[PDB]
Write a protein that binds this ligand. Structure first.
Ligand code: MG
Ligand code: MG
Ligand code: MG
Ligand code: MG
Ligand code: MG
Ligand code: MG
Length: 191
RNA sequence: GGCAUUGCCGCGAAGCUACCAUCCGCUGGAUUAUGGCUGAACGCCUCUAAGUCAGAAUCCAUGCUAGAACGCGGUGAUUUC
């Protein structure tokens, strides 16, 4: 159809400043600064009233206007990550063998060490992405929490931890052992 | 000592040689399938569309062989008569 114009809104809260050069977005908030390169999408940003950014596609097809809403969501996620932050809670699940998850250093790189997964003798090392903070939650049994400004990095670190613990050569409907994302929310409560 | 078309027999150094002997046979990236992240399309959902992660005896490199006899570089000496 090639819709003449399609646009989405990006509400900017008070403590957030959004600097958008050609398609390099820099969002700054209480928690830090996030940056994204969107030169692959061909959209047009415009600041309306310092609390609203409009992102528009002109003469755009179906896929183009779908990716317009994707761009809106990505900038929203940046703003949410610099205001509220992101936290993914993972639970260790095991029937017999206790999964031993720890934080270790190797050349100063902050790996998450997983030992004894399904009785294995192999040690699974998952690097911690920069900006992602790993805390083990006392008052909840076998809970690891990954927090950070960028949902991309926190969710990908959680997914890496989940995929390092995939069961091979077994019926995974029975052998349910693993480290699974149980909660995905924000750092600041009730925001 | 000769000859017996190496006369025959035992041992036999060297050389050649045998999974019949011994030694040696490298580690990075990108990927496929697949499993994922974020995420619209389609207020939800979604590994997919934009973007993105891991990943095969695969691929391309590292490494190994040849060195273009019309590919190239550095360097030495260049004829007293
Ligand atoms: Mg079986
Ligand atoms: Mg005679
Ligand atoms: Mg004789
Ligand atoms: Mg998801
Ligand atoms: Mg794609
Ligand atoms: Mg030659």
């Amino acid at each position: 159809m090639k819709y003449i114009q399609t646009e989405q809104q990006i509400e900017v809260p008070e403590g957030v400043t959004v600097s958008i050069k050609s398609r390099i977005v820099k969002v700054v908030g209480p928690r830090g600064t996030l940056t994204k390169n969107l030169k692959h999408i061909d959209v047009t940003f415009t600041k309306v009233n310092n609390q609203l950014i409009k992102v528009a596609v002109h003469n755009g097809g179906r896929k183009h206007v779908a990716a317009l809403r994707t761009v809106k969501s990505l900038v929203d996620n940046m703003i949410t990550g610099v205001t509220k932050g992101y936290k993914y809670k993972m639970r260790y699940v095991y029937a017999h063998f206790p999964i031993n998850v720890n934080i270790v250093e190797k050349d100063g790189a902050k790996f998450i060490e997983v030992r004894n997964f399904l009785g294995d003798k192999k040690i699974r090392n998952v690097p911690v992405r920069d900006g992602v903070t790993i805390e083990f939650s006392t008052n909840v049994k076998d809970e690891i929490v990954l927090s950070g400004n960028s949902v991309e990095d926190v969710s990908q670190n959680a997914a890496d931890l989940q995929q390092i613990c995939r069961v091979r050569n077994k019926d995974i409907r029975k052998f349910l052992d693993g480290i699974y994302v149980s909660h995905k929310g924000f750092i600041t409560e009730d925001l």
